[PDB]
Design a protein around this ligand. Structure first.
Ligand SMILES: Nc1ncnc2c1ncn2[C@@H]1O[C@H](COP(=O)(O)OP(=O)(O)OP(=O)(O)O)[C@@H](O)[C@H]1O
Ligand SMILES: Nc1ncnc2c1ncn2[C@@H]1O[C@H](COP(=O)(O)OP(=O)(O)OP(=O)(O)O)[C@@H](O)[C@H]1O
Ligand SMILES: [Mg+2]
Ligand SMILES: [Mg+2]
Lengths: 63, 422, 350, 84, 190, 168, 22
C-alpha cells in the first residue's frame, strides 16, 4: 500500500513511451489464421502502412 | 549486366593529418600503416642517420632528437617529409610507375607546398597518376553523405568545413586553435600546479604500487648518455594520450551545481603513471577539463595556447563555433547542412561531448532539426579520411580526373592544374 | 562434406598435414635450387644454388613457389587437389597484390574447389583455447605482434619486428667466430643453429648472470666450449643493439602495441597474452618476458604469459582446428565465386 | 485512433532492403523495436565499471539502428515541463 | 570444371580530356581479345551539361542588357557555370572577380543572358517544345526571391516561445484532426 | 553505393569473424562433437602422380549496426544469426519477396533514358524551416507487414457436413 | 615430430551438443 506522497511523486516521473512501430496488443496476433487469409505487403519505410481518417480543420471549423 | 560495381585500380591512398599519417591500398578497408607525424634524427656520428619507424623512435639513443612535421595540417620540413614518404613507400613494398597515388590534405594549404609535393610525386618517385582531394570532402566520402557539415575535432586544429553536393566551400571554413593540444597544455599545467612530476617509461626499471600522493619508490635505469628534451616530451605525449583517454568526461554545464556534491561522493579515480604515483583526480577537475573544449574558461593563458579567432575578443568554443558556421550559410541550404552533421576526430571518444553538443545546438538553434551523425566503430572515427580516399580511388567514374605526368608537363604551370584538376 | 587440406608456409620450413590431426604429416625446408626441390635438392649444392622462394613473409619469386606447392601437393601428401579444398597461411600486413596473385595462381593452376587464406598468428591464437590476446608471433624471418579481438586483428595495432631466428643465428656465428671457432659452412651454420636450440636459455637478468659453462661435441669429432654465449644470445633478442639493428626489443614492442589498442580491451589483453613461434621457445623466455612486462605494466592489471609446449607447430595446429570446424565450411571461397568476381574476391571474404 | 476495435494491419515484422554489393546480394536489417539499452580507497580508472559503461554508452548513442525517442514537442523550447 | 581465367589488363581512355594515355590497371574477366574495348565503361557517364556560350561578337546583342556588368565579369560567370555543373553556392564561393556580387544578382544576370541569347537564336526559326518551355520558366524575377529569402530568414530568426507555440498549435490541430468523424456524428445526433 | 557497401561489409566481416571465434571457443569446451564427421582419405598411388548455404547463388545478409564494442555481448534473439543462406529456397515462401524487391542504390537505372536522382530536400518546394516540416530521410528501405486479405472479410456461403438427415 | 597432447574435455560428449548447449 503506497503512501499518498508516493503516488503524487510517481505521476511526475513521466511515462515510458510506446513507439508507433511496436506491437501494441492491437495487431493480427501473427499468422494464427489461415495462410490463404493473409497477404504480405512490402512498403517503403517512408510511406505509412496504416493511416487514420481525418477531415481538414478548415472544413471542421466551417461545419 | 548493369555496372553497379565500382572498378579498383590498386591505387595507394596517402594522408598527412596533423598527428598521424595513414597510408593504405585502394580497395581495402583499413590502412596498412599509420606512422605518427614525427621523424627522428641522430647526429652523434659524422654522418647523418634517420629513424622513421614508430617503434624504433621510442628507444633511447645517445644523440637523438625528434622534430615535428605536421604543424597545423600544412606540410612543413618538406625535406624530411619526402624522406618519410619514401621510407613509407619502401616499407609497403609499393611498385612505382604502375600505381596511381591519391594524396589527401587539409582545407588550407600553401600553393608552393602543393606545387612541390606534386613535382616530387611526378618527377622523382615516377608515379603515373596523382590527385589532391580536400580532406573534408574525403571524410564526407567516407561517411557516404555528400551534403554534410564536417566538424573535425583533431589534435591541433578544429576545422568546420561546410560541404555542398560533395565539394567543400573554401571561404566558409572556420578554423579554431582550441583542440586536443589545448587539452594537453591545460592538463600539463594542472599537473604542474599539483606538483606531480611525470617520468618517461624507459626510465622505470623496477617499481611498486603506491596510492599515496607523496613520492613513490621507482628504481631508475640511468644510461651513460644524455637524453634530449624533445625525446622526453614525445614519450610524455603517450602518457597524456592514455590519461586523456581514461580520465576525461563532459557534462552539460551543470558542474557548478554538483561542485559541492562531487567531493562528498568521493568518485575520484586514480591514473597510475609509469612512476607509480596514483594521483587522485576529483570529478570536478575532470569535468572542467573536458568542458574546456566548449568554453575556454581557463584564464592562465593556456601555456602558449592564446586567444584565437576564426581562421587563426573571446574564444568561442565548439558549440558557438558550430552555431556561427551554421549562421553564415545561406537559408536555401542551411537545413540540409543542419540535418547532416558529421563529427569526426579521435577526441570525440571523450564521453558526453557529442550529446551535450547536440543539446546546445538544438537549444540555441530552435526550430531547425539538428541531428548529429557519428560513428560507432573506432576505426571509422580514427581514419575516416583514409576511408574516403580509398573509396574515391575505387570509384569507376573518378578515373577521368587523374593528373598525368605528361599532362603536368604539357600544362607546365601548376596553377592551371590546381584550379581545375585539383 | 569432404576433408579440408591445410598447408602452412613458414619462412624456415613449410608445414602441411590433414584437418583434425594433431601433427603435420611432413615438414620440409621449402628451399628451391634451380640448376629439383626440397632438402634432397639442398643436398646437391654444386650444380644448383639454394634459394628461398619465401623471404621476410613476401614471395620473392612465384616461379619457384609454384614448384613449392607442386612438391608439397604431389610428392609429400599426394592427395587430389581437384577435389580437396586447400587452406593456406599468410603473414599479416601482406601487400594486396601478393594475395591477389596467390589466389589467382591457385584457382587457375591447381583448380582447388575452395581456397581460404587467414592470418597465421590468429590461427596460432586459435590454439590454446582463447579467443582474445596478444600473439607474439615470431617466425624464422619476421616477428609479429597482433592484438586480437574475437579473431579480428585490430588493423592499426600490428607492429612488425625485423628480429628473426636467422639474424640471431648469424649473431651466434659471429660470437663463435670471435671465440676462436669459425664455421663457414652452411651445414656448420645449421649445426650452430642446433647448438643454440639445445643449450641456450634465457637469462633472468643480463647483468646478474654476466658477473657470475657448457661444451658440446661437434659432429665431425671435436668438442667446442662456450661459456657466455649460452645467455648472451637470448638477451640479444631483448636488446638488438649487439645486432646493430635500430628495431626495439620484444618487451618494448609489446608494450607499445598493447597501449596502441583500445583501453577497454587492455585489461583482458594483458591477462590473455599468448606467445608462439619456433624462435621464441627458448628456455626461460616466459619468466623474463613476464617480469619486464610487469615492470612496464600498470599495477592494477594482471600479466599472465601462456607459453604453450606445442610452439613449433602451434600455427598449423590452430589452422587444422579451424578447418575441421563445421561453421568454417561456409567461409570457403567457392570456385564459382572466383569465376564470377575475379581474384579481388579474396579481400572481401577472407 | 479512438476506437479500440481490431485492425487489419500488424506492426512491421521486419525491415529489409535488397542491395547488390561487390560480394553479391545482401539484405540489410535493423531491429523493428528498440532494445532497452544499457543491458549491461579511490578506485583505479581501469577497474571503474561505471566509466567503461559511460564510454560504451556515449560511443553507441548517435548512429544506432533505431534512433532515440527524441520527440518533437514544444516542452523543451518553453523551458518548462511537458506536463505544465 | 575450371574457372574463366581473370587477367590484369592496362585499361584506358576513361574519356579524360587531354588525350593522354594514362593507363590504370584493372582486373578483367576472360581473355581481353576484346582489349581495345574502347567503350571502357564509365565513359557512358562522361555526360557534360550543355550551356550555349557567347563570344565578343555576340556581346553586341548583350550590350543593351551597383551592377556595373561588363564583358569580363560575364565571361567569368559563364566559365564558372560551365566548369561547376550549375551549383549556385559553389559558383558564388569560387567566384573571385569582386565580392559585391550576391547570389540572386548572379542568378538573374545568368538567366536574362541565357534567355536573350536563346531568343536571339530562335529568331530566324521559331523555337518550340523543350526549348520554348525553358524560355518560359526563365521569366523569373529577382525581387520575389529576395523577398523569399528574407521571409525564410525572418521565420528562422523567431523567438523560441513563438515557434514552440506554433508547434503546439500544429500538434493540437492534428490531435483534433484525428477524431473528426466521431465529433461530426455526435454533432449531427445532437 | 560503394559507401553503403563498405559500411555493411565491415559490419558483416566483424560479425562473421566473431562468430568464427565463438565457434572455436565452443569447440575447445564441448569437445570434438561440433567438428565435422570427416570422410575417408583417397590416397593415390605413385603412378597417378606419374601421369600428373555454402553453395548456389548465395545471398549473404548483413548485421545490424553496433560494430565491435557492443557485439561481444551477442545481442541475439535466441540463436546465432543467419550469415549465409545459399539454399536460396527460403522455404519457397520468401523467394518471390527476395527476387522482386528493387535493388537499392543502383548506379544505372537499366539504361532507361538518362534520369537524375536529386537531393530529397530539392524535391520539396518547402525549405523545411521547421522541425515538423522535415521531409523523409529516404534511406531506401522496405518494411514488411502481414495483412488480413480483404476477400477473407467478404461474406461467404456456409460450409458444413450433414448428419444422419437434414440434407435438402 | 610427435603429438604432444589432447584436451577434449567434453563437458557434454552426449552427441547432442545442445544437451548442455540448451
Ligand atoms: N580516445 C581518445 N580520446 C581523446 N583523444 C584521444 C583518444 N585517443 C587518442 N587521442 C589523442 O587525441 C588526438 C586526436 O588526433 P587525431 O588522430 O584525431 O588527429 P589527426 O589524424 O592528426 O587529424 P586532425 O588533427 O587533422 O583532425 C591525438 O593527440 C591523440 O593522441
Ligand atoms: N628447438 C629450437 N630451439 C631454438 N630455436 C628453434 C628451435 N626450433 C626452431 N627454432 C627457431 O625457429 C625457426 C623455425 O621457424 P619458425 O617455425 O619459427 O617459423 P616459420 O613459421 O617457419 O616462419 P615465418 O612465421 O617467419 O613465416 C628456426 O630457424 C630457429 O630460428
Ligand atoms: Mg591532424
Ligand atoms: Mg613462424
Amino acid at each position: 500500500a503506497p503512501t499518498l506522497s508516493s503516488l503524487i511523486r510517481k505521476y511526475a516521473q513521466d511515462e515510458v513511451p510506446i513507439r508507433p512501430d511496436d506491437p501494441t496488443d492491437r495487431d493480427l496476433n501473427f499468422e494464427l489464421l489461415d495462410r490463404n487469409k493473409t497477404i504480405i505487403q512490402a512498403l517503403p519505410e517512408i510511406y505509412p502502412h496504416k493511416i487514420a481518417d481525418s477531415a481538414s480543420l478548415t472544413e471542421l471549423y466551417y461545419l | 549486366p548493369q555496372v553497379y560495381g565500382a572498378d579498383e585500380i590498386n591505387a595507394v591512398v596517402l594522408d598527412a593529418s596533423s598527428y598521424r599519417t595513414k597510408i593504405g591500398y585502394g580497395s581495402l578497408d583499413c590502412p596498412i600503416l599509420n606512422l605518427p607525424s614525427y621523424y627522428g634524427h641522430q647526429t652523434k656520428d659524422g654522418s647523418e642517420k634517420f629513424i622513421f619507424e614508430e617503434n624504433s623512435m621510442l628507444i633511447p639513443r645517445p644523440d637523438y632528437e625528434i622534430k615535428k612535421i605536421m604543424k597545423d595540417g600544412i606540410i612543413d620540413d618538406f625535406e624530411g617529409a619526402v624522406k618519410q614518404y619514401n621510407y613509407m613507400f619502401d616499407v609497403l613494398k609499393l611498385k612505382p610507375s604502375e600505381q596511381p597515388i591519391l594524396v589527401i590534405e587539409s582545407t588550407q594549404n600553401e600553393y608552393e607546398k602543393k606545387t612541390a609535393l606534386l613535382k616530387q610525386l611526378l618527377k622523382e618517385n615516377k608515379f603515373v597518376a596523382t590527385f589532391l582531394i580536400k580532406n573534408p570532402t574525403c571524410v564526407s566520402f567516407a561517411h557516404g553523405r555528400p551534403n554534410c557539415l564536417v566538424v573535425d575535432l583533431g589534435h591541433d586544429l578544429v576545422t568546420i568545413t561546410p560541404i555542398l553536393d560533395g565539394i567543400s566551400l573554401r571561404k566558409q571554413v572556420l578554423g579554431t586553435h582550441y583542440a586536443g593540444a589545448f587539452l594537453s597544455q591545460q592538463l600539463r599545467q594542472l599537473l604542474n600546479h599539483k606538483g606531480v612530476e611525470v617520468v618517461p617509461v624507459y626510465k622505470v626499471k623496477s617499481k611498486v604500487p603506491t596510492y599515496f600522493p607523496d613520492e613513490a619508490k621507482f628504481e631508475e635505469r640511468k644510461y651513460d648518455f644524455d637524453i634530449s628534451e624533445s625525446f622526453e616530451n614525445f614519450h610524455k605525449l603517450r602518457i597524456l594520450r592514455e590519461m586523456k583517454e581514461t580520465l576525461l568526461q563532459a557534462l552539460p554545464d551543470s558542474e557548478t551545481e554538483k561542485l559541492k556534491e562531487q567531493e562528498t561522493e568521493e568518485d575520484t579515480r586514480y591514473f597510475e603513471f609509469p612512476n607509480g604515483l596514483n594521483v587522485p583526480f576529483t570529478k570536478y577537475e575532470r569535468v572542467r577539463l573536458a568542458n574546456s573544449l566548449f568554453n575556454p574558461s581557463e584564464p592562465y593563458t593556456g601555456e602558449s595556447g592564446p586567444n584565437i579567432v576564426v581562421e587563426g575578443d573571446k574564444p568561442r568554443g565548439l558549440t558557438s563555433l558550430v552555431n556561427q558556421a551554421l549562421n553564415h550559410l545561406d537559408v536555401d541550404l542551411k537545413p540540409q547542412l543542419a540535418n547532416n552533421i558529421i563529427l569526426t576526430g579521435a577526441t570525440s571518444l571523450i564521453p558526453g561531448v557529442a550529446e551535450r553538443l547536440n543539446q546546445e545546438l538544438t537549444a540555441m538553434n530552435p526550430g531547425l532539426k539538428v541531428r548529429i551523425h557519428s560513428s560507432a566503430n573506432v576505426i571509422e572515427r580514427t581514419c575516416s579520411a583514409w576511408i574516403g580516399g580509398s573509396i574515391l580511388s575505387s570509384l569507376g567514374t573518378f578515373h577521368q580526373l587523374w593528373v598525368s605526368e605528361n599532362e603536368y608537363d604539357e600544362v607546365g604551370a601548376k596553377k592551371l592544374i590546381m584550379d581545375r584538376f585539383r | 562434406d569432404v576433408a579440408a587440406l591445410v598447408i602452412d608456409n613458414g619462412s624456415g620450413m613449410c608445414k602441411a598435414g590433414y584437418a583434425g590431426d594433431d601433427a603435420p604429416h611432413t615438414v620440409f625446408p621449402s628451399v628451391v635450387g634451380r640448376p629439383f626441390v626440397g632438402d634432397e635438392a639442398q643436398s646437391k649444392r654444386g650444380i644448383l644454388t639454394l634459394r628461398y622462394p619465401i623471404e621476410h613473409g613476401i614471395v620473392t619469386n612465384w616461379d619457384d613457389m609454384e614448384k613449392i606447392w607442386h612438391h608439397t601437393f604431389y610428392n609429400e601428401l599426394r592427395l587430389a587437389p581437384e577435389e580437396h579444398p586447400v587452406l593456406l597461411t599468410e603473414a599479416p600486413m601482406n601487400p594486396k597484390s601478393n594475395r591477389e596473385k596467390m589466389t589467382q595462381i591457385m584457382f587457375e593452376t591447381f583448380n582447388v574447389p575452395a581456397f581460404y587464406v587467414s592470418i597465421q598468428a590468429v590461427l596460432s591464437l586459435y590454439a590454446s583455447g582463447r579467443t582474445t590476446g596478444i600473439v607474439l608471433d615470431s617466425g624464422d624471418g619476421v616477428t609479429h605482434v597482433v592484438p586480437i579481438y574475437a579473431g579480428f586483428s585490430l588493423p592499426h595495432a600490428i607492429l612488425r619486428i625485423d628480429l628473426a631466428g636467422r639474424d640471431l643465428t648469424d649473431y651466434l656465428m659471429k660470437i663463435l667466430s670471435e671465440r676462436g671457432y669459425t664455421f663457414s659452412t652452411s651445414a656448420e651454420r645449421e649445426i650452430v643453429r642446433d647448438i643454440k636450440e639445445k643449450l641456450c636459455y634465457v637469462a633472468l637478468d643480463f647483468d646478474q648472470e654476466l658477473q657470475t659453462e657448457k661444451s658440446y661435441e661437434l659432429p665431425d669429432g671435436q668438442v667446442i666450449t662456450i661459456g657466455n654465449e649460452r645467455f648472451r644470445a637470448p638477451e640479444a633478442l631483448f636488446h638488438p643493439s649487439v645486432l646493430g639493428l635500430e628495431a626495439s626489443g620484444i618487451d618494448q614492442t609489446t608494450y607499445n602495441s598493447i597501449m596502441k589498442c583500445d583501453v577497454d580491451v587492455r585489461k583482458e589483453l594483458y591477462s590473455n597474452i599468448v606467445m608462439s613461434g619456433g624462435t621464441t621457445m627458448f628456455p626461460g623466455i616466459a619468466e623474463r618476458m613476464q617480469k619486464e612486462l610487469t615492470a612496464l605494466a600498470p599495477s592494477s592489471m594482471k600479466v599472465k604469459i601462456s607459453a604453450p609446449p606445442e610452439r613449433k607447430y602451434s600455427v598449423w595446429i590452430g589452422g587444422s582446428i579451424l578447418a575441421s570446424l563445421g561453421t568454417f565450411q561456409q567461409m570457403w571461397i567457392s570456385k564459382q565465386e572466383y569465376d564470377e568476381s575475379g581474384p579481388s574476391i579474396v579481400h572481401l571474404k577472407c | 485512433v479512438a476506437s479500440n476495435n481490431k485492425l487489419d494491419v500488424t506492426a512491421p515484422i521486419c525491415k529489409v532492403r535488397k542491395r547488390m554489393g561487390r560480394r553479391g546480394l545482401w539484405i540489410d536489417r535493423k531491429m523493428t523495436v528498440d532494445e532497452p539499452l544499457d543491458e549491461f580507497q579511490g578506485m583505479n580508472v581501469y577497474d571503474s565499471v561505471d566509466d567503461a559503461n559511460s564510454r560504451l554508452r556515449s560511443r553507441f548513442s548517435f548512429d544506432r539502428d533505431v534512433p532515440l525517442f527524441n520527440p518533437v514537442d514544444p516542452s523543451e523550447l518553453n523551458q518548462i515541463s511537458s506536463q505544465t | 570444371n575450371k574457372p574463366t581465367p581473370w587477367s590484369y589488363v592496362e585499361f584506358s581512355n576513361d574519356a579524360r580530356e587531354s588525350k593522354d594515355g594514362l593507363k590504370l590497371h584493372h582486373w578483367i574477366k576472360g581473355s581481353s581479345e576484346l582489349a581495345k574495348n574502347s567503350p571502357y565503361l564509365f565513359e557512358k557517364y562522361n555526360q557534360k551539361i550543355q550551356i550555349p556560350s557567347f563570344t565578343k561578337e555576340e556581346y553586341d546583342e548583350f550590350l543593351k542588357d551597383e551592377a556595373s556588368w561588363d564583358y569580363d565579369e560575364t565571361v567569368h560567370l559563364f566559365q564558372l557555370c560551365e566548369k561547376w555543373d550549375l551549383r549556385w553556392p559553389i559558383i558564388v564561393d569560387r567566384y573571385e572577380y569582386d565580392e559585391r556580387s550576391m547570389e540572386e544578382l548572379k542568378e538573374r544576370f545568368y538567366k536574362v543572358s541565357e534567355r536573350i541569347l536563346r531568343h536571339k537564336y530562335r529568331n530566324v526559326t521559331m523555337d518550340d517544345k523543350t526549348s520554348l518551355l525553358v524560355q518560359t520558366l526563365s521569366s523569373f524575377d529577382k525581387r520575389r526571391e529576395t523577398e523569399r529569402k528574407q521571409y525564410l530568414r525572418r521565420l528562422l530568426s523567431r523567438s523560441p516561445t513563438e515557434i514552440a507555440e506554433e508547434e503546439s498549435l500544429v500538434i493540437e490541430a492534428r490531435k483534433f484532426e484525428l477524431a473528426a468523424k466521431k465529433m461530426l456524428t455526435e454533432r449531427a445526433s445532437l | 553505393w560503394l559507401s553503403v557497401d563498405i559500411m555493411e561489409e565491415r559490419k558483416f566481416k566483424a560479425a562473421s569473424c566473431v562468430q568464427l571465434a565463438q565457434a572455436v571457443s565452443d569447440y575447445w569446451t564441448y569437445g570434438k562433437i561440433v567438428c565435422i564427421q570427416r570422410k575417408p582419405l583417397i590416397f593415390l598411388t605413385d603412378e597417378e602422380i606419374k601421369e600428373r548455404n555454402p553453395k548456389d547463388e548465395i545471398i549473404p545478409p548483413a548485421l545490424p549496426t553496433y560494430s565491435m564494442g557492443d557485439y561481444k555481448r551477442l545481442n541475439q534473439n535466441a540463436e546465432p544469426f543467419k550469415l549465409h543462406i545459399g539454399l536460396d529456397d527460403f522455404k519457397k515462401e520468401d523467394l518471390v519477396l527476395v527476387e522482386k524487391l528493387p535493388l537499392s542504390f543502383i548506379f544505372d537505372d537499366n539504361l532507361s533514358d538518362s534520369k537524375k536522382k536529386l537531393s530529397e530536400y530539392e524535391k520539396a518546394p518547402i525549405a523545411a524551416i521547421s522541425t515538423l516540416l522535415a521531409p523523409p530521410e529516404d534511406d531506401e528501405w522496405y518494411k514488411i507487414v502481414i495483412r488480413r486479405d480483404p476477400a477473407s472479410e467478404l461474406s461467404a456461403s456456409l460450409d458444413y457436413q450433414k448428419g444422419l438427415f437434414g440434407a435438402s | 615430430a610427435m603429438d604432444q597432447e589432447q584436451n577434449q574435455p567434453f563437458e557434454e560428449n552426449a552427441t547432442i551438443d545442445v544437451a548442455k548447449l540448451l
